[PDB]
Amino acid sequence: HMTGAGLRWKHTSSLKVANEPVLAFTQGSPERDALQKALKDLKGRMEAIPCVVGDEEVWTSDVQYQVSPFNHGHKVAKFCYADKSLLNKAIEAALAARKEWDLKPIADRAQIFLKAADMLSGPRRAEILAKTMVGQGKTVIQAEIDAAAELIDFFRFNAKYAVELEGQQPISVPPSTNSTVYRGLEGFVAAISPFNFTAIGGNLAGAPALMGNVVLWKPSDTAMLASYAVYRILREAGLPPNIIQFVPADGPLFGDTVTSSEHLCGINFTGSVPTFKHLWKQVAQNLDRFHTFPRLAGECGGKNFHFVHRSADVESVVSGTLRSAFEYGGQKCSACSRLYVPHSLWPQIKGRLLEEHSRIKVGDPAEDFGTFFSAVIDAKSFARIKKWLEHARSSPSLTILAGGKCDDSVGYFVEPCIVESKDPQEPIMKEEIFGPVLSVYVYPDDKYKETLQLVDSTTSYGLTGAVFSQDKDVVQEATKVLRNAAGNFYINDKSTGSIVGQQPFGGARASGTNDKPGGPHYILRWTSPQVIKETHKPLGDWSYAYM
Amino acid sequence: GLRWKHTSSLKVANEPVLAFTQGSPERDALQKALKDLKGRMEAIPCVVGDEEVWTSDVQYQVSPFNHGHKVAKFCYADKSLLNKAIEAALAARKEWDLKPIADRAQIFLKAADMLSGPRRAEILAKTMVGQGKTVIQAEIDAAAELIDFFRFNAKYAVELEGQQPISVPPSTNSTVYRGLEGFVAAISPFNFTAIGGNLAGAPALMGNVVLWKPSDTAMLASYAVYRILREAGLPPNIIQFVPADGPLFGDTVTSSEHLCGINFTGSVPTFKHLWKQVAQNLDRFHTFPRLAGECGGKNFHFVHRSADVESVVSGTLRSAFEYGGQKCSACSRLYVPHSLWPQIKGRLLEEHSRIKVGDPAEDFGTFFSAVIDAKSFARIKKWLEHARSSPSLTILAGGKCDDSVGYFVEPCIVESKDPQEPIMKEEIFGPVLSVYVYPDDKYKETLQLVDSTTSYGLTGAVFSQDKDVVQEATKVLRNAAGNFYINDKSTGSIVGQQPFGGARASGTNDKPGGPHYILRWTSPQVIKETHKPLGDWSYAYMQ
Ligand SMILES: O=P(O)(O)Oc1c2c(c(OP(=O)(O)O)c3c1[C@H]1C[C@@H]3c3cc4c(cc31)[C@H]1C[C@@H]4c3ccccc31)[C@H]1C[C@@H]2c2cc3c(cc21)[C@H]1C[C@@H]3c2ccccc21
C-alpha cells in the first residue's frame, strides 16, 4: 500500500516579483538630491579597484586607468589586468568552492540576489547610478534604466524564474519516484562584460552564479567603477568567496587562458561578433581537453531598423528614432541606425528630424542634467566613428543632413549625425558604428513591400527592429516578412528600452545565440539537470513474461 | 481583438508497454508482421520532398542475427542530392514555421496513434529484424518511447506557447517561438529507432526543416517511421530522408551557409569533429548553429552491503546485456562489496547459463540477439581477447564470439582486480559487464572512485536499503550520472518520467524526453506593441 504522508506529496515554491519602478528625477525629488550628492562624492576621488579572488584582493604589475568619457583628463578608477598565474589561481580556487555552492538550495542562492536587488533599489541606488554616469558617460535616465531598474529586475526575475524551474518536475508512476535536480554546470563559467550596460555585467556573472555555477568575471575596462560596485554589493549581499571572481584582464589574455583551461564549462559573452566567434573557434580547437562540452552564450551586433509606413504617427516616429539612435550616443546593441522613410512622408519627417536634432544638447551629464546624451566611451570607438563620419562626407551616395563634427579635446564628443543614403546597400546601412550616426533611406510608396524585403536582406544582423503604422494590415504583413529580421520587434515604439520580464532581449542571425536574457528560459543554459529515479519495490525476474 | 487570444493545453499519458503473452492479439499481429520480412528486401530511396531519388552508391542493411539476409537495399545521397535537399527544405521552411504549433503537433500526435495502433506490429518487426532487437527491447524503443517522444514533445511545444511575458499598459508583449533560420542536420544511431524519430521529429515539430541521415544499420525501421510522419500529414521538404556516408554528410552540412543545427546521437569523437567543422566554417554561417550531442556511456551499478541482493543481479543482468548491452545507458561497471560478492558471483554466473542468445524473430525465449554489424563485433572480440590476455582480468562467465550466421556475442562477465583498467573506462557497445570488488571498510573511497574513473557521466545506479548512504551517494555522484537510479537498473529511461542525458564527455545534456529539449530548436522573437503616441523625446528631469 501507499503512504499518506510520504512521497505521495509534491511542494512547489513561487515568487511574485514586480519591475523596479523608474524614478522621475524631477526638480525637488529626493533621488535627484541623493544622486547629485553621490556625483560630487566621486569628483577628485579615483577608486583603487583590485582583482578580487575569493576575499584576497590582489594587485598586479599591469595597472590600467578608467577615465570619464566626457573628461578623459580625470581618471575615475585605478585597476590592474590579472595575469595567467592569477587567472589560473582564480579558476582553481573557484572549482574548490563550486560543489558546496551548487549543493546550496536555490532559495538560499536566490535570497543573496534578492537582498542585493533591495539595497540596489534603496540606499546604494544613487552610488551605482553616479558611478555609471561618470564611468561610462550615461545621463541620469540612461543609468536609472540600466544600473538601477534592469540590474535589479535581472536579480529579481532570474531569482523568480529559478524557483519556478525547481517546481518543473517529471511524472512518477509506481514503484518509482522521479525528481529533476537542477545542477550548475561542472567547472567554471567565463563572464565577459561590455561597457554600455552595468546591468548586463551583473546578469552575465549573476545568472550563471544563481544556478550553482562559479564565475571568472572579466568586466569592461571602461565600465570598471560601476562594475566593481555591483560586485561589492553582491559580496555584502552574502555571496561566499570564489563564486564570482573579479578578474579584469587584457581581452586576448583572458580569452586564451579560460579556453585553454580543462575546467571551462561555459562562456557568457556580450560585445562584438568576431571576438565571440574567435572564442567559439578557440573552444573548438581545444575541445579534446575539456571535461564537459562548454556552453557558449553570446549577445553581439545589431544593425537595427525603424521602418516607417505612410500611415505612421510622424511625431512618434521622430521622438522614437531620436531616442533609439542617439540615447547614450547610440552605443546600444538595440540602437536604431537604419531609418526607412516613404517618399510622401519624407519632407515632413526630414524637416521635423533636423528641427528637433538642433534642440538636442550634448554636454557633461553630471553638471548639466539638460544633456540628452554625452561623449562616446573611448578614443578607439571615437576614431571608428570619426572614420564613419568622414565616410558620410567621402561616399557619393551619402549626404550628412545634420551633425557630422566631433571633438576629442575635452571628451570623446560626437554630434548626433543624420546621414541620407540614396543607396540602400551602402556599408553605412550594413556595418555597426556603435555611435550616434542614423542612416536614412527614402523609398517610393509603390515599392513599400520591396523595401520590407530590403530591410530583412540588407544586414547580417537580426537583433531589434520597429515598424510605425496606424494601418493594422501593414504591421500584420511587416510582422511576418521581418519575423527573423528582429529578435525584439516593436509596433509603434523605439527599438531600444527592453524591460526584463516584458521584452526578453536577444536576436538570431549574426546578433548571437538568442538565449533571451530577461525571459524565463535564459537560466536553462546555466543548469545541466540530473533526474533521480528511486524504485521502492524489489525489481523481480530479469526475464520477461513472453519467454 | 487586443486583450484576448486562444491558447491550448494538451494532457498526454505514456504509451503502455504491452506484455506480449501467448494468446494476446499484439503477439499474433507481430509474428504475422515478422513473417512478411522473412523473404522480402525493401528498396529504400532517398526522399527529397515527394521525389524518390536513387544514386550509384547503392548500400545494403542485413539482419544482425542472419547477415546472409539483405532486408533493406538503400543508397547514399551525394553532395549534389544533399545541397538539392537543403535548398528545397529552405523554400518550405517559412510557411512551415508560420504554421501554428497545434497544426504541427496534430501530425506527430496522429503519427504516434498510427505507431501505437495499426503500424505498431510493422515498426516492431522491422526494428527486431533490422537491428537485432528482441520483442520487449523493440516495444520500449520503436513503439513506447517513439509514441511518447511524439506525444510529450507535442505537449511541451503547446505548453511553451502559453509561456508569455508580462504586459504593462500602454504596451502589449507576446513571444513568437520561431524555428531556427536555416536547416537542422539530424544524425541518428542504430541502437534506438525512437531516438532517430526524435532527433529529426522534435526540431521539425518546432517549425524547423531537417536533413535526416539515419544509421545504415537501422535503415528499414527508420524509413518506416519517416513514412508514418509523411502520411500522418507532414508536408514535403520538412524532413528530407537522406541516407549518406557519415563523413561526407558531416562535410556537406558543416560547409552549407544555411546550417542552424546538428541534432547528433552516436560516437563522442564524431560529434567533436562536427563541432570543429562548424567552428572552422563559423564565418560563412548566417547564424550560430546549435549543436545537440548525445554521446558516451560507461555506466555503473554501485552496490552497498545493505542492498537487496536479488534486485542487484536481476537489474545488472538486464542493464548490461539487454540488446547485447548496446545502449548509451548500459551498465559496464559493477562495484560489489567483499562481504556480499560470494553471494552475487554465485547468482550472476547461475542466471548467465539460463540466457538464450539466438534468433529473436524465430525464438521469443531469446533474452538478447547478435550485436549490430561486423565492425561492432570485431571491437568486442578485441575486448574479449583483452579480457583473456590482461593480467588483472578474470573471465568469470562468457568469453567466446561466433560470426558464423550472425554477429553473436555471448554475455561476458569479467572480474577486474584493478578498477582503472581500460575495461572500466572505455565504451564497448556490446555484452561485456566488467566487475570490481571493494572492501565494506573502504566503501566511501570506492564511492569517490566510481566518480573519477571514466570521462563519461551519463547514467548510474546505487543499490542499498540503508537510506543514509543513498542520500550520501546522491551528493557524491552528482555529476557522475545525468540519470541517477536508486535500487533500479541504469537503462530503460521513460519519456516524461526520466528525461535522458548526462554531462561530462557523455554530451550536451539537452534532456530529450524532458520539457526543455524543444527550447534548443526555437529562437524566440518578442513583439512589443504600444497603442498610444510616444510623446516627446526629452524627459521631465532635463527641463
Ligand atoms: O491509491 P493510492 O493510496 O492513492 O496510491 C496510489 C497512487 C498511484 C498509484 O498508481 P496508479 O496511478 O497506476 O494507480 C497507485 C496507488 C495505489 C494503487 C496504485 C498502486 C500501486 C502500488 C501500490 C499502491 C498503489 C503499492 C503496490 C504498488 C506499489 C508500488 C510502490 C510502492 C507501493 C505500492 C499513483 C497515485 C498514487 C501515487 C502515489 C505515488 C506515485 C504514484 C501514485 C508515485 C509517487 C507516489 C509513489 C510512491 C511509490 C512509488 C511511486 C510513487
Numbering used by the authors:
A (entry chain A): 16 to 562
B (entry chain B): 21 to 563
What's the paper's own text on this?
Surprisingly, the CLR01 molecule was found in only one copy per tetramer in the asymmetric unit, and instead of binding to a lysine or arginine side chain, as expected, the Met17 of chain A—which actually belongs to artificially introduced linker residues —was seen as the guest inside the aromatic ring. The tweezer bound to monomer A is stabilized by packing against residues of monomer D. Interestingly, the regions around Met17 in monomers B, C, and D are disordered, indicating that the binding of CLR01 has a stabilizing effect on the N-terminus of monomer A, similar to the effect on the binding of a peptide to 14-3-3 described in the previous section. To further validate this binding mode, the anomalous signal of phosphorous and sulfur was measured at a wavelength of 1.698 Å at the synchrotron. Three peaks are observed at 2I/σI, at both phosphate groups of the tweezer and inside the ring system at a position corresponding to the sulfur atom of methionine 17. Although the anomalous signal is relatively weak, this strongly supports the binding mode of the tweezer encircling the Met17 side chain. A more detailed analysis of the tweezer binding modes using the CCP4 PISA software revealed that the largest hydrophobic Van der Waals interactions between the CLR01 and P5CDH monomer A are from the Met17 side chain bound inside the aromatic ring system, which is additionally clamped between two lysine residues that provide the positive charges to the region around the methionine. The interface of CLR01 to monomer A buries 487 Å2 of the solvent-excluded surface and covers about 69% of the tweezer’s surface.
The aromatic ring system of these compounds is able to include lysine and arginine side chains, supported by one or two phosphate groups that are attached to the half-moon-shaped molecule. Furthermore, we solved crystal structures of two different tweezer variants in complex with the enzyme Δ1-Pyrroline-5-carboxyl-dehydrogenase (P5CDH) and found that the tweezers are bound to a lysine and methionine side chain, respectively.
